[PDB]
Amino acid sequence: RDPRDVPGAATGKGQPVSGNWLGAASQGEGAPIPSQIADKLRGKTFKNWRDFREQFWIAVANDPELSKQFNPGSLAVMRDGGAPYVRESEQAGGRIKIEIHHKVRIADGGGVYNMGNLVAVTPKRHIEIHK
């Protein structure tokens, strides 16, 4: 399996975000985890990475502020645990959904479910970094 696909508990702090959170996903380092989401998840345990991802997008879709930034189509996906689809301009082939990347590699000491180690990125932006 991947290094992130491991049991753990969410910890750490997110960052305050704006009215267009995922606008940051396509540039620089990615979009930070919103402080409200880091809070909602704090202390929860996950059996594996797909469990975390599912709880993360459900939390987004239930948040009164962030859910305003997503249309009904997207929320229908997120309520079910799925990541939203990115804009066509941010798709990179077969990858068409927002991805969560670790800023510090787990092999280099990074926290798997530390919210300060996570960013949301589009596929196009991820590949700009790693190809």
Binding site: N71, G73, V77, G82, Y85, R87, E88, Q91
Partner: protein, 87 residues
């Protein structure tokens, strides 16, 4: 499955788009099945906005499955492409 949008009636295509849009789990029980249907949608419509019709729709029209269908129908008509099978 139907291969070309001209095999759908408009009502059939609306019901496929409503299924994708509402995330109907009876049709798409898995995330992987939904992704496939979105890729199928992009292929069928041939529309240059692709999945943005569903998720990032133009503010000039209704954000709904009917809005999506109408946009697709009117765009293909305006390019001289084949339309829906008659109902």
């Amino acid at each position: 499955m139907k291969s070309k949008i001209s095999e759908y009636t408009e009502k059939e295509f609306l019901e496929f788009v409503k299924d994708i849009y509402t995330n109907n789990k009876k049709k798409f029980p898995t995330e992987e099945s939904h992704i496939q249907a979105v890729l199928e949608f992009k292929k069928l419509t041939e529309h240059p906005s692709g999945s943005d019709l569903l998720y990032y729709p133009n503010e000039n029209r209704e954000d709904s499955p009917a809005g999506v269908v109408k946009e697709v129908k009117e765009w293909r008509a305006s390019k001289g492409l084949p339309g829906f099978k008659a109902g």
